[PDB]
Write a protein that binds this ligand. Structure first.
Ligand code: NI
Ligand code: NI
Ligand code: NI
Ligand code: NI
Ligand code: NI
Ligand code: NI
Lengths: 435, 435, 435
């Protein structure tokens, strides 16, 4: 899809505004709105000058402005704006060299895919994530200097009309798994795409979910553990690799899974805590990664066991042979999370890392001399951030991740880890006020 | 003080009830009230049969009842009870062998002092702690399945009458440091005693503080960090060792401190995380042990620096030469905390452990190649508990701490660590609800 | 009705979503919504992969996913959904063998009918149930750790428009018995069908009743005893057997009832407590099965007496000769309840079990030596579950009921029986608080 069709869309729909959208390192979606008459054919080869004071690494204290370069293939009319608006996802570029910014998640995902095609291991990667959310009727939260409080108060029309709006915005939905045990938790299934296209689709997914919940007087949250004792929100990711139109993950070994797939799983397992720094970036994210029942915390693979973090779905077709990693949560930044998973898999393929043996029939039942032995995902955000700081190397292959970008990301996550670490919590008043 | 004087006190004061008090492993103070006519001369050589279903290690699923053996030298009239009551602190003994229970904090402190006298290093140990508390006008807290909340709402008569009641109950008070910056925080200074006598005095201290605050319609808390950003409650402990009436901590080295004292500091520094498991037993306790200004988190000693955890007070008398460790908090169990500190010091003296060099002029200012190098106290309760589980050895010298007692203590602390770990906190709703 | 007509219905009505519905062992109706463009001709020969974490036996801890295979003959447009939805009832199949799941109520009902046709006793079975419900204006209930509470606050338009919506959804209604004594209690009469078709119709019946009551701001409940002293909700079931188009229940014996019918009644009477485990599955269900007036608790048959649980309606046509069993309640799972009744009748026919003699003129008036003699239905849910555990055999004939399915059902019922058993009830506070 080119720019000429975008101008044709502008004239066709009588678009008044164009909303240029990009993503922080935090994953939040930033936008600049320009009038539709400011969009010309030349606008797609210079972009728009932008002031980079966005939170995170973009708050670099030496530098000048950045460039918003739109991707014309991502244009879609916004369903929620009263004045007809055309949404375009943009990359952040350095104004001089006109190259992708080092601290741009979308540019990093594009670099990861380019490095994939460069190494010759595969031609493309297919990602299907399963982001789950919570729908609540109401919620009030706050934390002043004299205390804290939170209070959450828990239809088919909302779910169906979410699916309708998602299909308006170019997503191909194919199910909707409302859950009656742990009521409130929903998940819409969508079709697989490549890495950066699927990350853009996740951003659209969250946008639609939030706004449709708003219009029905509800509140949706993609927060990994919004509520005590009830099951948390996860985002399982199915990965496949394709070269010239055939799976590299289809083979003859365990559960019909190929040798390259086994090294992919080995690479994911080895770096899973550095990955956890990016796939599980919040402190809330580790209140659902606690050892127990149905918790994706054991770093091993099994088609049968459902305590293993890496699952191998059984499909009656060799053309659909993928691996599902289950520890990521929907609070991740899709670009950074997906790039981290891809690079871990590529480092596993490159170094012939063997995962080991399938943990078919060994759940959290605490085997006498195996519960401690099996690798686990990070236990807290500090541990994941420290392991990322130590294990930068697999992210730096091919120049996808800069040391400066990783440093800025880690500092930005730490300034929230510390705010959580130093406030006193009401459960500690319940337990330790008298003590 | 003997039992005959206790019976004389019963007849003299017209005592109606006798309140036998002991301490959990959690540090909470348990009691059994018996009528004064049940107290005879024989009562002081059989004790009282007790059902040991108290929380913690005392909930042992094989065993029968325990024996409450009173210490007649700890008898004191209760100021707060309408019907004249005589308080007596008791030890928990095994009914058959009639020996101190292995999971009894008071028995463990007595064993630690007996091991001190046995090793011949010193004859007695003097402990002076400085427990600080917060006085609030009101507080409401809670945590249901649909949220959490806490709300704290912040005179000379209360402080003075606390000191009066403490001197009624045998404590020798000598100051009262109300603090105007960080209003609400108080601390009463008292005179030094030996380990187990000082721990009993800390229990009396907390009892008096809580009840006097109750009667004035206030709420006192010995909780290490009850309130955000304001300075937390600590319990600095001054240790001295005496043999035949002279300090072993008085010498000619740094700040007039002796060689035995230097090995004591070395032993405290080496085991400071296993100690932290006992001196800093709550998860709240590590919201005040965060690196920063005036935080006793650097494991080093200095008479001048006040970022070092171990201070060496300057006193114009060789007869008062002590070391102050500043990381313990008032939520500790005085018996277990003091026994842990004493045993760490004794292991340092026994193994000639040298602390190193004084960190006189190096605060938290982050030296280029020293902030990471210097040992730190544990960063979380899980880390402290794991280090205790790994570093049992110094606690087991002389049989003071049993493996079974340590295991029960660690499990009892973990069941609260986990409850804190798995609830979602309102600050995480502030930070991650939209994310 | 085939799949081609279902695709034609999709195109004709402009259906946007397809709602695939199945039933728990608890009887609750579960659903998965897929977009209408995901429904193709091939979709009706592979089904949809489903995650079987549904409550009950489906929570089996070894197994992988299940298959939702739709029944194209059950397709009906949903009247209550804003976005046009097509409802299809589905069976749960094992993905490999592609056979009916052992713990699937609908598959069990299909197996029961297949076993009926296999044994050669009859060709088809006609079931007509009479489910009664309560319409309330409002209700609030709850049970916390500090108490419990319930409060129920009690037109022709609602009843008529229920009948209209039921006839929209393929049901053939033929009456509506609002009751003025015991106001609030309603019942819609519908036409007889075969077992599994009638069970599907009961599910539609409950769905329509609940949602139509919702839209008028009411609350309908199929709960056997929602209110004290007033008459409870039952579900009388008329059974008939047909072979080559003629009743096997039409004959010349008592009330024009045939010999095969008499053995059917004998088989129902013999196993009536194992049946009660399935037809009366709640603890509430035995607050209406209490001996007294108009209570269907005496295990005997009579055309005249209305204290007998099994009635023989008098019809002026040999083509309508059926037996009515009156103990089942609308909280039953229609598939399991109907399969249990059919298998009890078939075991009675197979073993030539004679019911005995009609109890024409013997009500609950307590005959001197007959009130104790006559068999009774189970007195509590525990007794019914124990009798089911002991009397599995008649359910296992022909492989309809698996031991594993029965075990899972019993455990799932017990986990609710125990929750009811261990909470204290407000009537026990009225009676025993002072005592
Ligand atoms: Ni168009
Ligand atoms: Ni999944
Ligand atoms: Ni005296
Ligand atoms: Ni001090
Ligand atoms: Ni039609
Ligand atoms: Ni009837």
């Amino acid at each position: 899809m080119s720019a000429e069709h975008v101008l044709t869309m502008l004239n066709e729909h009588e678009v008044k505004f164009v909303d240029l959208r990009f993503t922080d390192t935090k994953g939040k979606e930033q936008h600049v709105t320009i009038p539709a008459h400011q969009v010309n054919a030349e606008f797609f080869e210079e972009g728009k000058m932008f002031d980079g004071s966005s939170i995170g690494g973009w708050k670099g204290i030496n530098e000048s402005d950045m460039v918003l370069m739109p991707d014309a293939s991502t244009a879609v009319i916004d369903p929620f704006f009263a004045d007809s608006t055309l949404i375009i996802r943009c990359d952040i570029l350095e104004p001089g060299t006109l190259q992708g910014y080092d601290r741009d998640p979308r540019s990093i995902a594009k670099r990861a895919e380019d490095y994939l095609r460069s190494t010759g291991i595969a031609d493309t990667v297919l990602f299907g994530p399963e982001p789950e959310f919570f729908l609540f009727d109401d919620i009030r939260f706050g934390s002043s200097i004299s205390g804290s409080h939170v209070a959450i108060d828990d239809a088919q029309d909302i779910r169906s009309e979410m699916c309708l709006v998602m299909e308006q915005m170019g997503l191909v939905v194919e199910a909707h798994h409302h859950e009656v045990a742990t009521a409130g938790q929903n998940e819409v299934a969508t079709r697989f795409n490549t890495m950066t296209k699927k990350a853009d689709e996740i951003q659209i997914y969250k946008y639609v979910v939030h706004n449709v919940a708003h219009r029905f007087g509800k509140t949706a949250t993609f927060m990994p553990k919004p509520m005590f004792g009830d099951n948390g929100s996860g985002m399982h990711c199915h990965m496949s690799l394709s070269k010239n139109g055939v799976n590299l993950f289809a083979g003859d070994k365990y559960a019909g899974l190929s040798e390259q797939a086994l090294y992919y799983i080995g690479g994911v397992i080895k770096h899973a805590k550095a990955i956890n720094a990016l796939a599980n970036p919040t402190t809330n994210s580790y209140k659902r990664l606690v050892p127990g029942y149905e918790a994706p915390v054991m770093l091993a693979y099994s088609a049968r066991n459902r305590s293993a973090s890496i699952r191998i779905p059984v499909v009656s077709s060799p053309k659909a042979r993928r691996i599902e990693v289950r520890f990521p949560d929907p609070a991740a930044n899709p670009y950074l999370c997906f790039a981290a998973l891809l690079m871990a898999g590529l480092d596993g393929i490159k170094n012939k890392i063997h995962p080991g043996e399938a943990m078919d029939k060994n759940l959290y039942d605490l085997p006498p001399e195996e519960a401690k032995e099996i690798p686990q995902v990070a236990g807290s955000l500090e541990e994941a951030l420290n392991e990322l700081d130590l294990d930068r190397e697999f992210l730096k292959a091919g120049g996808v991740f800069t040391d400066e970008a990783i440093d800025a990301y880690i500092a930005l996550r730490r300034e929230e880890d510390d705010r959580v670490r130093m406030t006193p919590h009401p459960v500690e008043f319940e337990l330790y006020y008298s003590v």
